[PDB]
Amino acid sequence: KRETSGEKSRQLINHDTKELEKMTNRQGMLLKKKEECMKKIRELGSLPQEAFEKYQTLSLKQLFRKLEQCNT
Amino acid sequence: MMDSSTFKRFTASIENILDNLEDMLLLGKHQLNELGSESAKIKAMGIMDKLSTDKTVKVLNILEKNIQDGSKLSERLWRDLIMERVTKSADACLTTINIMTSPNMPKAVYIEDVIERVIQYTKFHLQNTLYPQYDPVYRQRVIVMLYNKVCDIVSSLSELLEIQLLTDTTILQVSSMGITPFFVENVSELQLCAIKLVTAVFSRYEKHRQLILEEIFTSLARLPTSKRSLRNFRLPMYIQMVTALVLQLIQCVVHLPDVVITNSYETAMRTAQNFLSIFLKKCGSKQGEEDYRPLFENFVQDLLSTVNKPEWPAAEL
């Protein structure tokens, strides 16, 4: 997206370019919050078992229900 | 060296020929012995940029190996016996080296089952073999080399436990072994390694202070009480071991990140005062059939014997 935004700004008037730059800055801040994510698992130090690969669900919605019920 | 891929490919060839010939049930002594010998330092920087699922399958394979003598319950069959324990002890060495090897270690390249397995292997085989013939109260170079492997594996266990959090269902028994050998005779370097382990478990977790002090006070009567080699910690001026154990518990808890310093430090004096209060009240009265007084006198002369050295503080406290 940043690549495409830069391309569009380079071909071009100014208001669309600064909107593209500000939304890439929001992308950068989203990158910033997606930087702590592989450390936050690291300080957990979680203990994995043999049943890791069988729980293969990419829904991410019933997964939250599973975490809620396990907490309960 | 940024890669030094000049024996990285040597080891990588070793595991790929191994898992080819085994996966498509034992791998023998000599190969795994040299594998651990090279694993000492060659992969200690080069373990990075290696295939993860191969690591999972090899730790599963050596897990299934250590299953065989896990709680093994054991003139010519004794040769098979000794070679079985030496083979699985080398396997234990490969486990405890392989897990710790990288300075930054990616999650779930390990499962706690194998660490549990090496722990129970350590428990049973140590209490079965090494204590009775190094302490006759509980009652050729193979025992010595097994001993050295035990020392190395428990040291690596200590630094591995400092590296990452473990579950309490591991913490209880690893603390049990960390305190266990402190009442037999010829185990001094094991006792240093046990000091390292109790540093790891004690500074890493704040929830087992009560636990540790209770198993401390339980078996104090098992002390050797011998004039020979009672003080074996250099600072002449050799000192008794469990005194320095107490000292390093005292200085071990800091929890360095504001007022966290103050509350943690007063927590340290509170933990110390609970320790010494309970120890004193157990000592003071004369219990049936035994006493805790001579423990208290030798303990305190060692305490004021190490009163003023810049790497042993808090004796003044």
Curated annotation (Swiss-Prot), chain A:
The protein's location, in the record's own words, is: Nucleus; Chromosome; Chromosome, Centromere
Q: Where is the signal peptide?
A: none
Taxonomy, superkingdom: Eukaryota
Query: Which regions span the lipid bilayer?
Result: none
Miscellaneous note, as given in the UniProt record, is: Mutated Cornelia de Lange cell lines display genomic instability and sensitivity to ionizing radiation and interstrand cross-linking agents.
The family classification in the record reads: Belongs to the SMC family. SMC3 subfamily.
Disease linkage = Cornelia de Lange syndrome 3 with or without midline brain defects: A form of Cornelia de Lange syndrome, a clinically heterogeneous developmental disorder associated with malformations affecting multiple systems. Characterized by facial dysmorphisms, abnormal hands and feet, growth delay, cognitive retardation, hirsutism, gastroesophageal dysfunction and cardiac, ophthalmologic and genitourinary anomalies. Cornelia de Lange syndrome type 3 is a mild form with absence of major structural anomalies.
Subunit note: Forms a heterodimer with SMC1A or SMC1B in cohesin complexes. Cohesin complexes are composed of the SMC1 (SMC1A or SMC1B) and SMC3 heterodimer attached via their SMC hinge domain, RAD21 which link them, and one STAG protein (STAG1, STAG2 or STAG3), which interacts with RAD21. Also found in meiosis-specific cohesin complexes. Found in a complex with SMC1A, CDCA5 and RAD21, PDS5A/SCC-112 and PDS5B/APRIN. Interacts with NUMA1, and forms a ternary complex with KIF3B and KIFAP3, suggesting a function in tethering the chromosomes to the spindle pole and in chromosome movement.
Please identify the protein, giving its name as recorded: Structural maintenance of chromosomes protein 3
* Gene symbol of the encoding locus: SMC3
Q: Which residues of the full protein are shown?
A: 245 to 974 of 1217
Swiss-Prot record, chain B:
Copy the domain comment: Contains one Pro-Xaa-Val-Xaa-Leu (PxVxL) motif, which is required for interaction with chromoshadow domains. This motif requires additional residues -7, -6, +4 and +5 of the central Val which contact the chromoshadow domain. The C-terminal region containing HEAT repeats and Pro-Xaa-Val-Xaa-Leu (PxVxL) motif are involved in the recruitment of NIPBL to sites of DNA damage.
Tissue-wise expression: Widely expressed. Highly expressed in heart, skeletal muscle, fetal and adult liver, fetal and adult kidney. Expressed at intermediates level in thymus, placenta, peripheral leukocyte and small intestine. Weakly or not expressed in brain, colon, spleen and lung.
Q: Which residues of the whole protein are included?
A: 1193 to 1583 of 2804
What gene is this protein a product of?
NIPBL
The family note in this entry says: Belongs to the SCC2/Nipped-B family.
Localization recorded for this chain is:
Nucleus; Chromosome
Q: Which disease is it linked to?
A: Cornelia de Lange syndrome 1: A form of Cornelia de Lange syndrome, a clinically heterogeneous developmental disorder associated with malformations affecting multiple systems. Characterized by facial dysmorphisms, abnormal hands and feet, growth delay, cognitive retardation, hirsutism, gastroesophageal dysfunction and cardiac, ophthalmologic and genitourinary anomalies.
Assembly and interaction partners: Heterodimerizes with MAU2/SCC4 to form the cohesin loading complex. The NIPBL-MAU2 heterodimer interacts with the cohesin complex composed of SMC1A/B and SMC3 heterodimer, RAD21 and STAG1/SA1. NIPBL directly contacts all members of the complex, RAD21, SMC1A/B, SMC3 and STAG1. Interacts directly (via PxVxL motif) with CBX5. Interacts with ZNF609 (via N-terminus). Interacts with the multiprotein complex Integrator. Interacts (via PxVxL motif) with CBX3. Interacts with BRD4.
Provide the transmembrane region boundaries.
none
Its name, as the record gives it, is: Nipped-B-like protein
Residue positions, PTM Phosphoserine: 5
Purpose: Plays an important role in the loading of the cohesin complex on to DNA. Forms a heterodimeric complex (also known as cohesin loading complex) with MAU2/SCC4 which mediates the loading of the cohesin complex onto chromatin. Plays a role in cohesin loading at sites of DNA damage. Its recruitment to double-strand breaks (DSBs) sites occurs in a CBX3-, RNF8- and RNF168-dependent manner whereas its recruitment to UV irradiation-induced DNA damage sites occurs in a ATM-, ATR-, RNF8- and RNF168-dependent manner.
